[PDB]
Design an enzyme around this catalytic site. Structure first.
Site, PDB file in Angstrom:
ATOM      1  N   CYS C 155       0.830  -1.201   0.000  1.00 37.74           N
ATOM      2  CA  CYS C 155       0.000   0.000   0.000  1.00 37.74           C
ATOM      3  C   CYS C 155       0.864   1.251   0.000  1.00 37.74           C
ATOM      4  O   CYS C 155       0.601   2.205  -0.740  1.00 37.74           O
ATOM      5  CB  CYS C 155      -0.925   0.003   1.220  1.00 37.74           C
ATOM      6  SG  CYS C 155      -0.038  -0.241   2.786  1.00 37.74           S
ATOM      7  N   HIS C 182       0.998   5.164   9.849  1.00 36.79           N
ATOM      8  CA  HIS C 182       0.198   4.100   9.260  1.00 36.79           C
ATOM      9  C   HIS C 182      -0.782   3.524  10.273  1.00 36.79           C
ATOM     10  O   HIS C 182      -0.445   3.314  11.438  1.00 36.79           O
ATOM     11  CB  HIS C 182       1.161   3.023   8.699  1.00 36.79           C
ATOM     12  CG  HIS C 182       0.526   2.066   7.745  1.00 36.79           C
ATOM     13  ND1 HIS C 182      -0.284   1.033   8.163  1.00 36.79           N
ATOM     14  CD2 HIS C 182       0.569   1.991   6.395  1.00 36.79           C
ATOM     15  CE1 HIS C 182      -0.708   0.360   7.109  1.00 36.79           C
ATOM     16  NE2 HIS C 182      -0.211   0.924   6.024  1.00 36.79           N
TER      17      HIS C 182
HETATM   18  N1  LIG Z   1      -4.405  -4.211   5.268  1.00 41.08           N
HETATM   19  C1  LIG Z   1      -3.556  -3.418   4.625  1.00 41.08           C
HETATM   20  O1  LIG Z   1      -3.375  -2.233   4.865  1.00 41.08           O
HETATM   21  C2  LIG Z   1      -2.752  -4.052   3.518  1.00 41.08           C
HETATM   22  C3  LIG Z   1      -2.408  -3.252   2.438  1.00 41.08           C
HETATM   23  C4  LIG Z   1      -1.672  -3.789   1.400  1.00 41.08           C
HETATM   24  C5  LIG Z   1      -1.291  -5.105   1.471  1.00 41.08           C
HETATM   25  N2  LIG Z   1      -1.619  -5.871   2.530  1.00 41.08           N
HETATM   26  C6  LIG Z   1      -1.141  -7.284   2.477  1.00 41.08           C
HETATM   27  O2  LIG Z   1      -2.189  -8.133   2.209  1.00 41.08           O
HETATM   28  C7  LIG Z   1      -1.995  -9.405   2.872  1.00 41.08           C
HETATM   29  C8  LIG Z   1      -3.137  -9.673   3.825  1.00 41.08           C
HETATM   30  O3  LIG Z   1      -3.307  -8.611   4.749  1.00 41.08           O
HETATM   31  P1  LIG Z   1      -4.742  -8.340   5.488  1.00 41.08           P
HETATM   32  O4  LIG Z   1      -4.639  -7.004   6.172  1.00 41.08           O
HETATM   33  O5  LIG Z   1      -5.891  -8.598   4.564  1.00 41.08           O
HETATM   34  O6  LIG Z   1      -4.608  -9.499   6.603  1.00 41.08           O
HETATM   35  P2  LIG Z   1      -5.894 -10.167   7.382  1.00 41.08           P
HETATM   36  O7  LIG Z   1      -5.214 -10.819   8.532  1.00 41.08           O
HETATM   37  O8  LIG Z   1      -7.004  -9.174   7.503  1.00 41.08           O
HETATM   38  O9  LIG Z   1      -6.436 -11.235   6.288  1.00 41.08           O
HETATM   39  C9  LIG Z   1      -5.809 -12.479   6.104  1.00 41.08           C
HETATM   40  C10 LIG Z   1      -6.893 -13.505   5.813  1.00 41.08           C
HETATM   41  O10 LIG Z   1      -6.316 -14.729   5.369  1.00 41.08           O
HETATM   42  C11 LIG Z   1      -6.925 -15.810   6.045  1.00 41.08           C
HETATM   43  N3  LIG Z   1      -5.968 -16.886   5.974  1.00 41.08           N
HETATM   44  C12 LIG Z   1      -4.842 -17.063   6.741  1.00 41.08           C
HETATM   45  N4  LIG Z   1      -4.161 -18.122   6.429  1.00 41.08           N
HETATM   46  C13 LIG Z   1      -4.855 -18.671   5.386  1.00 41.08           C
HETATM   47  C14 LIG Z   1      -4.632 -19.815   4.606  1.00 41.08           C
HETATM   48  N5  LIG Z   1      -3.584 -20.607   4.820  1.00 41.08           N
HETATM   49  N6  LIG Z   1      -5.511 -20.100   3.641  1.00 41.08           N
HETATM   50  C15 LIG Z   1      -6.555 -19.290   3.459  1.00 41.08           C
HETATM   51  N7  LIG Z   1      -6.873 -18.179   4.122  1.00 41.08           N
HETATM   52  C16 LIG Z   1      -5.983 -17.920   5.081  1.00 41.08           C
HETATM   53  C17 LIG Z   1      -7.298 -15.252   7.417  1.00 41.08           C
HETATM   54  O11 LIG Z   1      -8.303 -15.964   8.079  1.00 41.08           O
HETATM   55  C18 LIG Z   1      -7.761 -13.849   7.028  1.00 41.08           C
HETATM   56  O12 LIG Z   1      -9.097 -13.849   6.567  1.00 41.08           O
HETATM   57  C19 LIG Z   1      -0.626  -9.309   3.546  1.00 41.08           C
HETATM   58  O13 LIG Z   1       0.360  -9.757   2.640  1.00 41.08           O
HETATM   59  C20 LIG Z   1      -0.523  -7.797   3.783  1.00 41.08           C
HETATM   60  O14 LIG Z   1       0.786  -7.350   3.955  1.00 41.08           O
HETATM   61  C21 LIG Z   1      -2.344  -5.375   3.544  1.00 41.08           C
END
Ligand SMILES: NC(=O)c1ccc[n+]([C@@H]2O[C@H](COP(=O)([O-])OP(=O)(O)OC[C@H]3O[C@@H](n4cnc5c(N)ncnc54)[C@H](O)[C@@H]3O)[C@@H](O)[C@H]2O)c1
Ligand SMILES: NC(=O)c1ccc[n+]([C@@H]2O[C@H](COP(=O)([O-])OP(=O)(O)OC[C@H]3O[C@@H](n4cnc5c(N)ncnc54)[C@H](O)[C@@H]3O)[C@@H](O)[C@H]2O)c1
Ligand SMILES: NC(=O)c1ccc[n+]([C@@H]2O[C@H](COP(=O)([O-])OP(=O)(O)OC[C@H]3O[C@@H](n4cnc5c(N)ncnc54)[C@H](O)[C@@H]3O)[C@@H](O)[C@H]2O)c1
Ligand SMILES: NC(=O)c1ccc[n+]([C@@H]2O[C@H](COP(=O)([O-])OP(=O)(O)OC[C@H]3O[C@@H](n4cnc5c(N)ncnc54)[C@H](O)[C@@H]3O)[C@@H](O)[C@H]2O)c1
Ligand SMILES: [Mg+2]
Ligand SMILES: [Mg+2]
Ligand SMILES: [Mg+2]
Lengths: 336, 336, 336, 336
Positions: C155, C182
C-alpha cells in the site's frame, strides 16, 4: 404552513438535526432558517460537510456571505452566546431547537421567546418547570398549543421508553433497574482535567466511567404508569457513537425468552414501527451507526429467569434523537 | 533562598509541575504556595491523587478548608479567572507558572505582575512581546534579572533544540524540515465540534490530524544561528501522551548513521546530560511515559543518505516539559 | 474476455477487493468465481455484509449451500489452508489474488499454479523470485504474458511511487527519506503479546510503534531510476484505517512550495489521473476513508526550504490498494 | 518443599503470573523453573521488562543462553508447541500453569502429565472433565491430593463468586442476571477478520461487542447452592484492561442500598479479605489497574428497589486472576 425552525447550538445534535432533515428529503414540512454557534460560516459549513462519526454529507454545502447554503437553501449563520439577543422575531421563528447544553430550564430557554421565537424544544432533559417531556412515538399526544418550552427527553429515555412500553402492557413491570453503556460525548475530556463530575474529569478514551443519569426515572414523565418503578445509571466507554440500554426488571407474571421477544416483535411491526426495531442478527454497536430508530431491540440478547427479564436495545444516541427532534417539532406546531 | 511559586492553571501541565516537584523530593529550592483553577479544593486534590496517564500520586493529598495539603505542605487553592485579582503580592509570590493556555502574551500574562507577583513563566510559546523564550539546557544563559515575563517554549521545541544543536556544531545544518507525531491534548475534541482550527475540530480519537506548529521556526529564537533554517508541522494521533520529533535535514558535509549517533551519544553523556538521552532498545511511545528528559533520541531509527539525515527523538510532552519548568524557574531567579 | 478470479485469503484486502469490484459496477471485466478462507459460508457472507471501517455493503449477500451469492453471482466458498489442494483448474481460474500474507514468494505462491490456476498476484511485496512488482499507473507496461507470479507491491509503495514520479521528472530527486504514519493492521496485537517484531509485539491501540518497511527502497523496483535513492520507516499509530506518506527529499535544483504543488496538480489531472489526486482542503485522515486513489497528495502540507522538499500524501491502505489489485489483474491478463 | 512451577503460554496471564510472583516478594513457596512459548529468550525477556497495560517491571531481567534471569533467578526458556514433548519430568515440575488458551480440557491438558508434570492448573474455564473448578477464597476446600488437572475458572467467575456469596448468605438469591462490561483480550481482532464468534470477528477497538460467557452458570460449579440461579452475557468494549461485573438479582426478602453495602463491607473485612474489597471513592476503571483483588465492590453504584438489587464490582482481569493462580497453586499442593 411550513414551520420556520432555527437551531441554537450547531453541535453533534444540532448538526445532525440539519443533516437528518436534508438526508430524508425534507420529509417534514420544515425550513431551517438560521443556526447559531460560536464559529463563522466557513467553520459551520465545513463541519456540516465532513464528519468523523457519520461520514461526508450527501448534499452540497457552500458559503455565501453570512449564509450557509445547503442543497440550494440559504441558512443564516449567527454567532451570539446570549439567546435573548438572537433575532428570532425578525426571522419569524416558530420553533427554536435548543441544543447548546446550556439552557435546559424553562427560565433559561425562555430567553429565545424574548428574542421573538414562538416555541422552544430543548434537546435534553428539561428542568421541572418545562411544559412537557416528549418521547415521540410514546406520548406526543400530551402536547398542547399553549405549550411553549418542552423537552425531547434524552437519547437514553427515547430508547428505554419504546422498549418498556409493550412489555408493561403485556407482562407488566413491577420494578426495574437499568444500566446504559454509552459512547462518550463532548462534555467529557481527553486526558484528566477539571470537570464538575469527578468521574467525567477522567479520560474518556481510556476507561469505563460510571456517571449518573435520570433517563430511567424519566420514563415516568412520558409513561406515568412506570413512575417510580425504574432507576439506573450509565457507564461511559471509549466509543465515539452508538450506545446500549441494558434493562433488568421483575415482570408481574412468569414469562419466557420467546414471549418477551414476541411482544417486542409485534410492537416493532405495529404501533411502534420505525421508532422501535427488532433485530435477530449477530451485530455490534457500529452496525447501528446512522440508524434513525430510537430503540433497536436485540432479540439475540434476551434473558429470562422466572420473573427476572433482561432486555437490551442499541441506539445511535446522535442520529435517532436528532430525527425524533424533527418529529416532535411537527407535533408541537400541530398540537391543538 | 527558596523561591515562592504559584501555578495558574492546574491542568495537565500545572498538575504535573507539582507532581514532578514532589516525586523528585523537592530537589529544586522551590515551594509551591498556591494554585488557581476553576474547581474547588476537593476537585484539585482528587485529580492530583489519580491520573490516567501517570497513575496514582505516590504521596499524600488531603483537603483543609481553602487549602490542599501535599506531603504536609499547605497549598492555597484559588478559583479566580482574572489574574490581576489573584493575591500574589499578599502571598509574596516570586514566580507565577502560567499554565491556563489563555495568557500567553506579555500583555495578558503581565496581569500577574499587577496582582503582586515578581515574575511570570508562561508554559507555552509566548507572544512576540515576551522578554525571552527559553529551552533549558540550551539558552538559559540569556536570562536577566530585569526579565519579568518569559516563555518556556513548547514541548516540541524543548525536544527539537537539544537534538539539533549537537548535530549543527559537528555537521552543520544547511536547512531542515520537521514532522512531530504528537499525542492529543485537551485543546482537541472527542467528536467533531467547533474549533478555531478546522482540523482540530475533528475527533482526536479517530484520525491523524495535521496542525501547524511554530516549534521549528522557534528554534531560531533560542539558537539565532539556526534562525530561518527549520520549518515543520505536527500530526496529532490518537494517543493520550508521548510524542515523537522526526527531523530531516541537509548537513553541510557527507556523514553516516554511525557518526550521527555518536555525536548525539556524546552530547547525552556530557553537555546535554539528562536533557537529551540516548536509547538503543526497540521501544514504543508508552515506554517513554514519565520520562523527565526533554529529548529522548532513538538511535535505532537513524537514517542517512549522503547529505540527508533523518533523526528521531521521543518526548513525554507533559512530563519532560513540566520538569523543565522547574529548571527554568530556578534559572530565572538566579539571573543577574 | 472476462477474467476468472479467485480470492485466497478473504481478509481486509481480500474482502475489499470483492467490495470494490461490486461497488464500481463490475467495471473491470472480471468475475470472482470463488473465495477461500478458514470459515464457513455463513461467516464469510456476514463479514462481507457488515464492516467497521467501511460500513454496510450496499448490495445483497446470501448463502446457498457452499456458495455465497453477491448481487446474484454465485461464488464458491472454500476452507483449505493448502493452495495445492484448491480446485482452481476445475473452476478455470485465470488469476489467484493471494491475500493471506503466507505465500509471498514465487515458490510458495506456485502452489496455486499446481492447483490449476494460470497466474497469481500477491497482494504484498514479493520475494526476490517474483516475476514483477507492479504499481498500477506507474509500471504496468513491464508485464509480460509469460509472467505467472507477480506482486502488487505494498500500500505504501503504491502511494509513494505516483507521488515521486512527477517530481523526479520535473525537479529531479537526488535522495529522499520517508516516514509513513500508518493505521494498525491485523498483524499487530491488541495488548502486548508475542510477535517476531518486538515493537509490533506492543499494543497497537496504545502507542506509536516504529516498524521497518521496504516501501521506500521498493520504489526502485517500480521506478528503477530511483533505485538506491529512497529509504524510510513506518510509525504505526492507533487508527483502524487510512495512512500518510511523508517524504523529505533533496531536489536537484532549488524550487518553491508553489512549483512543487503545480507539478503534482498537473500529474493528477493528466497522466496519473484517478491514481493520484490533488487536495487543497483542510482535511484529516478519516476524510480519505473509502477513497479509491493510490495517492491523495495534500497540497496544504507542502513545505520547501531551498532544495529540501517535504510532500505528504494520504492513502486508504485497504481501499486504494484493493482497487489497484483489480487494475493489475486486467493489465496482467492483457500483457502480450 | 518449595513448589516447582512452570508457565505454559507466557502471554497476558502467564507473564503477569511471573510478575505477580516477583512483585509480591515471592511470598508463595513457589519457584518458577521454566516458561514455554513460541519465542526466543530475548523476546520473552523484553516482554517481561516492558508492558503497556502494567508499565515497566520493577525488577531486573537478563538473558543467559537458553535462560531468562529474573531478579537473579534462572528460568529455562522453551519453545515447543506440544505439551507431551516438554521436559517436565526432567525439570521435576510439580505444577504446570496452562495459560496458552489451547489446552482447556483435561484430555488436552493431560499431555503435560505425560510430559512428566505432577499437576496442571488451567488458567481458564476447563472442560466438564476437569477434576475441579476453583475460585480461591470460595471453594479451594474441595481440592484433593488425587486431583491432577483443575481449572482456576475465569476472571469473571472469580469476580462474581465472592460478590454474590455474602449476599446469598444474608439475603438469599432467588435468581440473578449479570452483564460484564469487559476489556478486550488477545482473542479479539483489530479490524474485522475471521473468528469462530461472529461478533468477536469485529474490531474490538471501535465497538461494544456482546459475547457469550459461562461465568454466571459456572458460579454453580464453585457454589452448588447457586446452581441454575445465575445467567448473563458480556459486552467487550475498547479498553485494554480492567472489567466490571454488573449483577442484578431478586433477593428473597426486601432490603436497602445501605444494608447491601454493609453485608459486602463486613465480608471484605472478614472471610473474603484480600479477595473482595470495598470502595467508596469516585473512581473509574483504570484506577483498579494492577489491583490484585478478585472483586473490587463499588458501593457508590449500588441500587436497590424492594427485592431487586444491582451491585457492581471492578476487577483487573489480568492482575487479580494471575495472583489467584499463585494462591490456587499452593492450595492444590497442600491438599490432602
Ligand atoms: N491491510 C492493509 O493495509 C494491507 C495493504 C496492502 C497489502 N496488505 C497485504 O495483504 C496481505 C493480507 O493482509 P490483510 O490485512 O488482509 O490481513 P488479514 O489478517 O485481515 O487477512 C488475512 C486472511 O487470510 C486468512 N488466511 C490465513 N491463512 C490462510 C490460509 N492458509 N488459507 C486461506 N486463508 C488464510 C485469514 O483468516 C484472514 O481472513 C498481507 O500480505 C498484507 O501485507 C495489507
Ligand atoms: N450527543 C448525544 O449523544 C446527545 C444525545 C441526546 C441529547 N444530547 C443533548 O444535546 C445537547 C447538546 O449536546 P451535544 O452532544 O450536541 O454537545 P456539543 O458539545 O457537541 O455541541 C454544543 C454546540 O453548541 C455550541 N455552543 C455552546 N455554547 C453556546 C452558546 N451559548 N450559544 C450558541 N452555541 C453554543 C458549541 O460550540 C457546540 O457547537 C446537550 O443538552 C446534550 O445533553 C446529546
Ligand atoms: N499538555 C502538553 O503536552 C503541553 C506541553 C507543553 C505546553 N503546553 C501548554 O501549557 C498550557 C496548558 O495546557 P494543558 O495541556 O495543561 O491544558 P489543560 O486544559 O489540561 O489545562 C488548563 C487548566 O487551566 C484551567 N483554566 C482555564 N481557564 C482558566 C482561568 N481563566 N484561570 C485559571 N485556570 C483556568 C483549566 O480548568 C485547566 O485546569 C497551554 O498553553 C499549552 O499549550 C501543554
Ligand atoms: N487475559 C485475560 O484477561 C484472561 C483472564 C482470565 C483467563 N484468561 C485465559 O487465560 C488463557 C490465556 O489468555 P491470554 O489473554 O493470556 O492470551 P494471550 O494470547 O495473551 O497469550 C497466549 C500465549 O500463549 C502462547 N502460545 C500459543 N500457543 C502456544 C503453544 N502451543 N505453546 C506455548 N505457548 C503458546 C502465545 O504466543 C502467547 O504468549 C486463555 O485460556 C484465557 O481465556 C485470560
Ligand atoms: Mg490585589
Ligand atoms: Mg486439485
Ligand atoms: Mg517427554
Amino acid at each position: 404552513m411550513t414551520i420556520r425552525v432555527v437551531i441554537n447550538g450547531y453541535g453533534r445534535i444540532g448538526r445532525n438535526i440539519l443533516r437528518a432533515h436534508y438526508e430524508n428529503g425534507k420529509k417534514h414540512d420544515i425550513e431551517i432558517v438560521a443556526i447559531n454557534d460560536l464559529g463563522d460560516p466557513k467553520t459551520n459549513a465545513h463541519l456540516t460537510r465532513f464528519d468523523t462519526a457519520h461520514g461526508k454529507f450527501p448534499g452540497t454545502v457552500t458559503v455565501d456571505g453570512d449564509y450557509m447554503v445547503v442543497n440550494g437553501d440559504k441558512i443564516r449563520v449567527l454567532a451570539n452566546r446570549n439567546p435573548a439577543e438572537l433575532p428570532w422575531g425578525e426571522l419569524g421563528v416558530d420553533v427554536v431547537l435548543e441544543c447548546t447544553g446550556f439552557f435546559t430550564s424553562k427560565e433559561k430557554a425562555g430567553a429565545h421567546l424574548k428574542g421573538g421565537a414562538k416555541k422552544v424544544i430543548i434537546s435534553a432533559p428539561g428542568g421541572k418547570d418545562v411544559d412537557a417531556t416528549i418521547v415521540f412515538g410514546v406520548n406526543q399526544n400530551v402536547l398542547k398549543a399553549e405549550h411553549t418550552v418542552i423537552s425531547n427527553a434524552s437519547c437514553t429515555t427515547n430508547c428505554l421508553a419504546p422498549l418498556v412500553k409493550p412489555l408493561h402492557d403485556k407482562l407488566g413491570v413491577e420494578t426495574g433497574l437499568m444500566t446504559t453503556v454509552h459512547a462518550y460525548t463532548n462534555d467529557q475530556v481527553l486526558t484528566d482535567v477539571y470537570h464538575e463530575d469527578l468521574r467525567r474529569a477522567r479520560s474518556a478514551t481510556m476507561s469505563m466511567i460510571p456517571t449518573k443519569t435520570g433517563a430511567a426515572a424519566a420514563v415516568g414523565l412520558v409513561l406515568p404508569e412506570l413512575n417510580g418503578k425504574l432507576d439506573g445509571f450509565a457507564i461511559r466507554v471509549p466509543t465515539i457513537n452508538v450506545s446500549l440500554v441494558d434493562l433488568s426488571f421483575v415482570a408481574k407474571r412468569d414469562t419466557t425468552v420467546e414471549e418477551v421477544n414476541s411482544i417486542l416483535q409485534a410492537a416493532a411491526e405495529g404501533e411502534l414501527k420505525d421508532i422501535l426495531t427488532y433485530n435477530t442478527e449477530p451485530l455490534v454497536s457500529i452496525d447501528f451507526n446512522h440508524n434513525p430508530a430510537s430503540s433497536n431491540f436485540d432479540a439475540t440478547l434476551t434473558k429470562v429467569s422466572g420473573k427476572l427479564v433482561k432486555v437490551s436495545s442499541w441506539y445511535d444516541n446522535e442520529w435517532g434523537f436528532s430525527n425524533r427532534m424533527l418529529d416532535t417539532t411537527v407535533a408541537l406546531m400541530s398540537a391543538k
